[PDB]
C-alpha cells in the first residue's frame, strides 16, 4: 500500500530512541549465531530483525542500528534487508495485524475473500492499510499465504484462520478483541466450519486404512 | 518572442536546443538554477542581424517558448536596436501572445 520505502524521521521512530535487546533475547541471539559459520554472522540479520520486531513492536530505525551493531554490519546493509522483506513493519502496527490473502485461489475458493475483506471492513469501520482508533487491529491484504486449499483464510499475527465465511471471520476478530483481557477467550487457530486440516469435508477418500511401517523392505536393506 | 504559461511563468527551461540547431549562431544562452531552484535562463540573446528567419528554433522547442511572431514591421534606426536580450523578447511575447496563441492553435496539428 502506502508503505514508504525510505525513512521518515518521526518522534516515535528516529535514531535517538535507544534500543537494547532484553537479557532473555540475548540468550536467543547466541543460539541464532551458533547455526551460522562464525565469520558469516551477518547471516543472522533476518533472525535478529524479527527478534527485534517482536520485542520493540516494530522494526524501528534504532532496532536496525542495534542489529547492525551486533552483527558488525554497515547499517545501510540492514536498512536494505528490512525494506526488501515484507514481514518487517517499519511503521507501527496495531495489537493485531490482520493479513487477508486476496490472490486468485483465495478469490474463488469458499466465498472468495471478497466478503472476507468486506466483513473485516464492515466489522472495524476501517479501510485497507489504516489501523483502528484504539490500536487493537491493523488490516492489510497480502499474497498467497500458503494455505490455498483452505481458502478464504487470513493471518492475524502468527496463526492462520482458514476456511472462513464472512460470518465466522467476523467472530474471529471480535474474539481477538476480547481475548486481550482474558486469554481464555482466544480463538482456536486453524480452519473454521468443521474441516480439520486440508481434508475432504465429505469424508476422507485416502489414507483410511491402517498405515504400514518397516514391514516391507527387501533383504538387501 | 519568448512566451509564458497561463500563470505568467516563463516557458523557457534553458535546454539550449535552439542554440544548438541555429544555422547562423544567432542565439546565445546562459542559464543557472534560479533563487527557487528553477532551471531558467540568465541570458537570452538573439542577434537579429545574424538570424536567417528559418523557424528551426521554434521547430525544436520542447515547450513552445521561442516563436516567430507574424510581425514583419520592426525596422530600426540602428543595429544595436536589433540585438534582442531576454528583456526585449519577453516583452515581445507579453505583447503578441494573442496572435502567437492563435497561430499555434491553427498550426499545431500539422507539427
Amino acid at each position: 500500500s502506502d508503505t514508504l520505502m525510505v525513512h521518515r524521521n518521526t518522534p516515535e521512530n528516529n535514531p535517538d530512541i535507544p534500543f537494547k535487546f532484553t537479557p532473555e533475547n540475548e540468550k536467543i541471539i547466541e543460539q541464532i549465531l551458533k547455526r551460522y559459520p562464525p565469520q558469516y554472522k551477518k547471516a543472522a540479520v533476518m533472525p535478529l530483525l524479527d527478534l527485534g520486531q517482536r520485542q520493540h513492536g516494530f522494526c524501528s530505525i534504532s532496532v536496525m542500528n542495534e542489529v547492525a551493531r551486533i552483527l558488525e554490519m554497515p547499517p545501510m546493509r540492514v536498512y536494505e534487508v528490512a525494506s526488501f522483506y515484507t514481514m518487517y513493519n517499519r511503521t507501527p502496527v496495531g495489537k493485531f495485524h490482520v493479513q487477508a490473502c486476496t490472490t486468485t485461489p483465495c478469490q474463488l475458493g469458499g466465498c472468495g475473500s471478497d466478503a472476507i475483506v468486506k466483513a473485516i471492513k464492515e466489522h472495524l469501520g476501517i479501510n485497507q492499510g489504516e489501523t483502528t482508533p484504539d490500536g487493537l487491529f491493523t488490516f492489510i491484504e497480502v499474497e498467497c499465504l500458503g494455505a490455498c486449499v483452505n481458502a478464504p483464510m487470513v493471518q492475524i499475527n502468527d496463526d492462520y484462520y482458514e476456511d472462513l465465511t464472512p460470518e465466522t471471520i467476523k467472530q474471529v476478530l471480535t474474539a481477538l478483541k476480547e481475548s486481550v483481557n482474558d486469554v481464555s477467550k482466544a480463538p482456536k487457530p486453524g480452519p473454521q466450519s468443521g474441516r480439520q486440516s486440508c481434508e475432504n469435508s465429505a469424508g476422507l477418500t485416502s489414507l483410511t486404512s491402517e498405515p504400514w511401517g518397516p514391514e516391507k523392505t527387501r533383504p538387501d536393506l | 518572442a519568448l512566451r509564458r504559461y497561463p500563470s505568467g511563468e516563463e516557458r523557457c527551461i534553458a535546454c539550449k536546443l535552439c542554440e544548438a540547431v541555429c544555422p547562423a549562431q544567432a542565439i546565445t544562452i546562459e542559464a543557472e538554477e534560479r533563487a527557487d531552484g528553477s532551471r531558467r535562463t540568465t541570458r537570452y540573446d538573439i542577434d537579429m542581424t545574424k538570424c536567417i528567419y528559418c523557424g528551426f528554433c521554434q521547430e525544436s522547442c520542447p515547450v513552445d517558448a521561442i516563436v516567430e511572431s507574424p510581425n514583419a514591421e520592426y525596422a530600426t534606426e540602428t543595429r544595436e536596436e536589433l540585438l534582442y536580450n531576454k528583456e526585449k523578447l519577453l516583452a515581445n511575447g507579453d505583447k503578441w501572445e494573442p496572435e502567437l496563441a492563435a497561430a499555434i492553435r491553427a498550426d499545431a496539428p500539422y507539427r
Binding site: T22, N25, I28, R54, G57, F58, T131, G135, N157 | -
Partner: protein, 32 residues
C-alpha cells in the same frame, strides 16, 4: 493519531517470543 503496540519500557516484550524461538532454547548439538 491512534495508539499502538509500541514498547513503553525497555525491559518489556510487546510480542511473545513464540513457539519457534523457545524451541531454539531447548536446542542442543549433543546427544543426551
Amino acid at each position: 493519531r491512534p495508539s499502538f503496540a509500541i514498547a513503553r519500557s525497555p525491559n518489556e516484550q510487546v510480542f511473545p517470543a513464540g513457539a519457534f524461538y523457545e524451541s531454539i532454547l531447548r536446542w542442543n548439538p549433543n546427544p543426551v
